[PDB]
Amino acid sequence: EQGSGYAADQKSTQNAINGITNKVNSVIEKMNTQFTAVGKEFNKLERRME
Amino acid sequence: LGNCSVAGWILGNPECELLISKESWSYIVETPNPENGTCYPGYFADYEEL
C-alpha cells in the first residue's frame, strides 16, 4: 500500500564481488615464472638436438 | 627391412638385395638384433644422425 520499488542487496553482492576479485587475482597470480622459450638453432648434422 | 640393419640397407648389404626395388613406403621395420648388417666391419660415422 505504501509504495513499491526495485533494489540491489549489498552484503551478498559484496561477498560475491570479493569472490570475483579473488578469482581473477588467483588466476593471474597462480601462474609461476616465465622462461625465455626462444627457439634456438642447431646444425644440419646435430638436429637430434633440434 | 627384414634381416639387414639400416646401416646394412642404405649400403645395399648383399643379404637384402631384394630390398632394392622398393622406393616408396610408409614406415621402416627392424628386427631388434639384425645380424647381417654392415658386412665389411668398421665404424659408421655419425650413424645415429643418419
What would the grid cell of residue B16 be? 637384402
Query: How many residues would you count in chain A?
Result: 50
Q: Give the C-alpha separation, B11 to B39, whole Å.
A: 9
Burial class (CB in 10 A: 0-12, 13-18, 19+), B3: middle
Decide if A45 and B48 are in contact by the 8 Å CB cutoff: no
Closest-CA distance, B9 to chain A, in angstroms, reads 21
Non-local CB neighbours of A46 within 8 Å, separated by 6+ positions: B49
Rounded to whole angstroms, the Cα distance separating B19 from B30 reads: 13
Residue B8 contacts residue B39 (beta carbons within 8 Å): yes
Does the distance separating the beta carbons of B48 and A46 come in below 8 Å?
no
Q: Where are the beta strands (DSSP E) in chain B?
A: none
**Nine-digit cell string for B47:** 650413424
B46 contacts A48? CB cut-off 8 A: no
Which technique was the structure solved with, according to the deposited record?
cryo-EM
Element (H, E) at A29: helix A11-29
Residue B12: alpha-carbon gap to chain centroid: 7
Q: Nearest Cα to B50, choosing from B6, B17, B15, B12?
A: B6
Q: How many CB atoms lie within 10 A of CB A28?
A: 8
Percentages of chain A per state (helix, strand, coil), in multiples of 5: 40, 0, 60
Q: Tell me the structure's resolution in angstroms, rounded to a single decimal.
A: 3.6
Half-sphere CA count of B50, side-chain side, radius 13 A: 11
